[PDB]
Amino acid sequence: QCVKLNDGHFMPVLGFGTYAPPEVPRSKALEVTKLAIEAGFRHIDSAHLYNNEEQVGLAIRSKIADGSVKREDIFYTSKLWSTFHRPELVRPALENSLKKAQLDYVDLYLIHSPMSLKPGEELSPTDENGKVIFDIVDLCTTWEAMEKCKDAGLAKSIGVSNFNRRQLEMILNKPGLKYKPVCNQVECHPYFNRSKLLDFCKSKDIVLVAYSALGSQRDKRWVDPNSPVLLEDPVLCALAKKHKRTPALIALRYQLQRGVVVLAKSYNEQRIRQNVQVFEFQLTAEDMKAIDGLDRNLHYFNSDSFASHPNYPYS
Template identity: 55%
Template sequence: MNLTAESHSIALSDGNRIPLLGLGTYGDPRTTSKGTALECVKLAIDVGYRHFDGALVYFNEHEVGQAIREKIADGTVRREDIFYCGKLWNTFHPPELVRPALERTLKTLKLDYVDLYIVELPMAFKPGNEFYPKDKDGKYIYHHTDLCATWEALEACKDAGLVMSLGVSNFNRRQLELLLNKPGLKHKPVSNQVECHPYFTQPKLLEYCRQNDIVIVGYCPLGSSRDASWVNVKCPPLLEDELLVSIGKKYNKSSAQVALRFNVQRGVVVIPKSFSPERIQHNFQIFDFSLTEEEMKAIESLNKNIRFVELLMWSDHPEYPFLDDY
């Protein structure tokens, strides 16, 4: 695979293409200052990024959309150069809420379509104005999930031209099979966005998805923040790994660049999130070196099967995806 900074997209099963390196745009709305996403996405486009991963529940899609529109207006890119992934949140799973949720994202972005729209989690929450509905005791309020019905509503959105490709996120094999075996399936999921990095290489899920022409999009490709409120801090910091550091030294690269290159080289899309201008540029500099087969195998053997993002607060949901082997 000859990957360059200008050309590093791979084919999706529906004929569209997805860039292997994207920018994640999640930022804690309580601590991220206004305008941060706007400036960072504009910078990223100047650096060479063409793939942006966002979501309604990140509360910054208006800034991401504005950045994309400004860069189209100044002639840096055309709309068709940009690949934007949006997400259907847990409170919008009922079929009648799917299109309005997507239209809300489009209105916020001020774009006519998104390139990829994915079911963010296989777990439905009680529909309503609250994204994280809780009862009076502070317990999350769940909703019955019919993933096939949700998917049919998404298929209708694709047929209407509101989205180019459809995918899922955090789905295990059983949940993917539910969709793939759905009677009358019109559009199969082209991607599954899951945690994926050298300490959690997802060999079984990766193989299953490859067999079914589903691209894996890896979130937390550099590990994760060390925020104990939602991250498993028992897992050692990935970027301090001696093997990644030593391979990096050989190529005059950082452990982060080695970790990103590892996934990209095996056809896994990576969406490292950063609002640091230096890191945004740094993470993009992975196309001027490649890892040998031996190095790829050595990094694969770092797998500890430990998730940073376990989402344990929802582990009692009937569709919690991480109890299965994969």
């Protein structure tokens, strides 16, 4: 159950989301990554930002050592954080991710976000009035350094995340482009279905990878507590009743049938195992149209500061 990427590599269509907020002890990521692998997940999404690559990498080594999987059975994604966009910083950022995880390579490396931040050791650099410090970087140069990570064998595939159409075209029209982005990992769910971006991506052989596909973790630091709770949506619950599944399963299946590769974060053993049942049933064309009607241009992530950034993707 994979999709063929535009560089000839294969991505599993269901991915495991690994981010958990800092109140969750770091040992949990180790435990639940093992559980996801045990359940059947093979595509695993992490990032430098998530402060978990060591734990996720150790789960993977653990499941290889005990004979459940081989390295080449696992599709592992990491991401370049926005403080490392300057081209000279890209390779060392990846090498550090690889060292942490103890892998020789990632299956996929992404530019996490187009919103460049000031180089340094803070993930979130701020000035003397507490304002986040943006950086200005030609992302075409970042991308060239990404291509070099691929040729260097350190990333089998390269792509982007949180790019809008204009940003994607800037890469696609770059003079001397060697590798297209294989994907664009973006927020995508029935309340924000991205159909326009998705059709653009499809026209360019670029895979759209959905995050917050289950409505996000509703973290009080970035998500308005008054936003509607996706999985309480009454169309989603009535489809769940109809198919005898769950609303999460409806949300995940929706993405698969529209050609979207979908991530699903759970740190709960039974929900982890539930999510792999997405492959067991199908929505009707009329179900899919019903879900398509739910879009409300709702993005769960908000930060007013990021909105002023010149590369803010929702400009």
